[PDB]
């Protein structure tokens, strides 16, 4: 219904080049490969997508002044105007904004330390109707802005980078009891 803290979601777009609904989502490996990359989801029946390296987990939502409070040095629900974290659900690295380029569009990498404004992202409404202060429903289109670099989570042409041009981003849920078969899992298949 809404996007509560400490669950598992994605980020996603549609790439349009000459009547393409090329639905790319966001993935990143880490592990000797810091730069984030792409994963198409339009070609689903074509190719089962490698979805284990795409998901993310929210650690913490606060307000902007609460982010200043942390920068002096409980499953709440996020609102438009919160600053969030995004750990990579597989690798354990936190998603940040690198200070390198590949113009002045900054690269998007994974890192370790939660200190500093690299790991943090504000949310902004992609609606004239739905605006600041209210909740974020499932599947709301939204814009993500870094705290440090103050750039949008831009989809370039096909790069993914922090830039001064806006780019829509949709969020879809993935997951949220013990001893019980729960999908997306790796396991053994016994015989006897």
């Amino acid at each position: 219904q809404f996007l509560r803290t400490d669950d598992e979601v994605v980020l996603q777009c549609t790439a349009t080049i000459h009547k393409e609904q090329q639905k790319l989502c966001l993935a990143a490996e880490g592990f000797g490969n810091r730069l984030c990359f792409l994963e198409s989801t339009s070609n689903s029946k074509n190719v089962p997508p490698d979805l284990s390296i795409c998901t993310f987990v929210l650690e913490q939502s606060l307000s902007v002044r609460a982010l200043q409070e942390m920068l002096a040095n409980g499953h709440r629900t996020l609102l438009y105007g919160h600053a969030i974290l995004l750990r990579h659900s597989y690798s354990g690295m936190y998603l940040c904004c690198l200070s390198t380029s590949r113009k002045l569009a900054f690269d998007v990498g994974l890192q370790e330390d939660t200190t500093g404004e690299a790991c943090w992202w504000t949310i902004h409404p992609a609606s004239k109707q739905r605006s600041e202060g209210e909740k974020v429903r499932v599947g709301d289109d939204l814009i993500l802005v870094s705290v440090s670099s103050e750039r949008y989570l831009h989809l370039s042409y096909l790069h993914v980078d922090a830039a001064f041009q806006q780019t829509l981003w949709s969020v879809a849920p993935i997951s949220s009891a013990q001893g019980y078969l729960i999908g997306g899992d790796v396991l053994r298949l016994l015989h006897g």
Partner: peptide, 30 residues
């Protein structure tokens, strides 16, 4: 360090990255 003053100043680093010096030497003798 006042926080956001650093980040605005970094944005100012981000544009015209000291290639200004070409304009510094090129003007001064025309």
């Amino acid at each position: 360090a006042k926080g956001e003053a650093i980040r605005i100043r970094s944005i100012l680093r981000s544009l015209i990255p000291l290639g200004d010096l070409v304009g510094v030497i090129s003007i001064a003798f025309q």
